[PDB]
């Protein structure tokens, strides 16, 4: 009965040279029982990408909630929301449920359309923003991801190199965690093109 | 805390140590536990700092609003407002407050308000963790209608012992003198009182 580790899952985000990468595993289980190997944890609202780990019902609920909020934002502002602004929106929304929180570990990733700057950010379940130059990690294998990212990462990686680093960070972290894995997805995000790759990983 | 208030010939004197503890760590060694709720109505605070502080602020607000409508309140009135808060919220409060004030009609008065929320008008009052060690001393040494210098010595010697034995008490000995003359603040440092 620990909400954060019932369904399982991981998300990781990295920055490169004029690009960002966000990746996640595909597992959804009920403790020991693996149930679904298609459960994606990364969503997007315009050019802003959001990964969400933790309790799967809240992962779904928040996605639907942020879609709701970003749609009204766009109608009133007459423009797409930016990652910095969206990050604030996430923090507000999470802290609004301070004493009955969504059991999640969200991760924002994207490139600011005006300045062109790569941007990533993480949160705890209660809304505290964790901004980072290098990388953000989240999920049941966060310790593993921290260890992989902190050793493998280097600044100013090209999109094709960044893909290899983030993928190897996710895969090797996932294989040391029982509740993560069962497939993986990696988003490579450039200023005006986005490539989505499904990784081949061990299915246990 | 070690705190006390003592009536005497010319009025009343409040006394307190300056030690605030979070466990065995001293968070503040120069605390001011003597707080003004009105010109010549002060109080000593013991128990939860947050609770006594929140209460004292509300009392100060009430007495300010009282003064705007009905003029200067009595020391009894001040103690009644304290009581009302402490009694009605007894389940959520850990506050032991001594109220002391100077009227011109009633002279010096001391009211003590323990945890329960009961009121007790006394010639002098002692309270806080360190007061346990000076019940014997204070009872044997207190006299009514003391002078200012005698009362200051009585409080100084008392709080000196309370401080010496109680780990939760220490630092400087602050005092506040309430008389017709006005309001006087006194302080006494370890190098003086320790070797009494």
């Amino acid at each position: 009965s620990d909400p954060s580790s019932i369904n399982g899952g991981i998300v990781v985000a990295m920055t490169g040279k004029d690009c960002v990468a966000i990746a996640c595993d595909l597992r959804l289980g009920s403790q020991s029982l693996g149930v679904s190997n298609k459960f994606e944890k990364i969503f997007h609202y315009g050019h802003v990408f959001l990964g969400i780990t933790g309790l799967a019902t809240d992962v779904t609920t928040l996605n639907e909630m942020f879609r709701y909020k970003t749609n009204l934002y766009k109608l009133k502002e007459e423009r797409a929301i930016e990652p910095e602004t969206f990050t604030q929106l996430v923090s507000s929304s999470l802290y609004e449920r301070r004493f009955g929180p969504y059991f999640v570990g969200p991760v924002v990733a994207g490139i600011n359309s005006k300045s062109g700057k790569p941007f990533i950010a993480g949160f705890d379940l209660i809304g505290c923003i964790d901004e980072a130059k290098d990388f953000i990690v989240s999920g049941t294998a966060s310790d593993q991801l921290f260890g992989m990212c902190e050793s493998l990462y280097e600044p100013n990686l090209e999109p094709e190199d960044l893909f290899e680093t983030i993928s190897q960070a996710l895969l090797n972290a996932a294989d040391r965690d029982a509740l993560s894995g069962w497939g993986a997805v990696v988003y490579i995000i450039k200023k005006d093109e986005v490539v989505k790759r499904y990784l081949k990983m061990r299915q246990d | 805390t070690s705190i006390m208030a003592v009536t005497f010939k010319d009025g009343v004197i409040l006394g307190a140590d300056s030690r605030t503890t979070t466990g065995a760590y001293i968070a503040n060694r120069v605390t001011d536990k003597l707080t003004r709720v009105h010109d010549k109505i002060w109080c000593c605070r013991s128990g939860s700092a947050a609770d006594t502080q929140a209460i004292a602020d509300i009392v100060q607000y009430h007495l300010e609003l009282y003064t705007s409508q009905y003029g200067t309140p009595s020391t009894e009135t001040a103690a009644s407002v304290f009581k009302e808060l402490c009694y009605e919220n007894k389940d959520n409060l850990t506050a032991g407050i001594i109220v002391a004030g100077y009227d011109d009609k009633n002279k010096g008065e001391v009211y003590t308000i323990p945890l329960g929320g009961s009121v007790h008008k006394l010639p002098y009052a002692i309270a806080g963790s360190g007061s346990t060690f000076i019940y014997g001393y204070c009872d044997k040494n207190f006299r009514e209608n003391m002078s200012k210098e005698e009362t200051v010595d009585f409080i100084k010697h008392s709080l000196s012992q309370a401080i010496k034995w109680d780990g939760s008490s220490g630092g400087v000995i602050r005092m506040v003198v309430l008389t017709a003359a006005g309001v006087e603040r006194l302080i006494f440092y370890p190098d003086e009182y320790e070797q009494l």
Partner: protein, 222 residues
Amino acid sequence: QFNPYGDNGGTILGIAGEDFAVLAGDTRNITDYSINSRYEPKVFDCGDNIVMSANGFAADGDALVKRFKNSVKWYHFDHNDKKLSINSAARNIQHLLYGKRFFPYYVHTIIAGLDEDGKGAVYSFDPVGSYEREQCRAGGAAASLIMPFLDNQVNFKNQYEPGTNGKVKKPLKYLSVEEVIKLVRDSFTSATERHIQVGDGLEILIVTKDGVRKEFYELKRD
């Protein structure tokens, strides 16, 4: 109520080569949020070319190392100065640990040395005696950070041959002592960055047929 256990933190790491083996461990010792020592070694030369470290609760760790060291001594007396092989040492340690199955030594134990064919060997234990020979093991507080990095860099996990359509795996090969020490130093600096109980200093004990050599490196002291 009295709690007989405590967490002294730190982290250890063992890597095996072709004709050598390393056992590394940070020199920091802690309790709660306080640093006890910036240099308190927990990787020991136990004789017969066996290095040992029992990371976790230092009292139990020191007790175990002390007993094993003594076990080596009496092995010589009782068996005509015969050299204790690494596989024999491992089994002996299992019995030491399991001997206290119902009041355990709170330590993740790792020993390293050379097997009877002269090849590098790392054995690793749980707190109650379960053991297994491996090419690679990280133990202690930052084990969860370091271990997956080793899987990737020592055993070449999840690494495929470029352009083979993820069909041919990267071939397994032994690492040089120079390459291993690089991985150790990067593992510990990375673990120091993200784990509060790891830092101060890094002490590596290298084991070859020639003997036991030491190497020390500074780590971040925050």
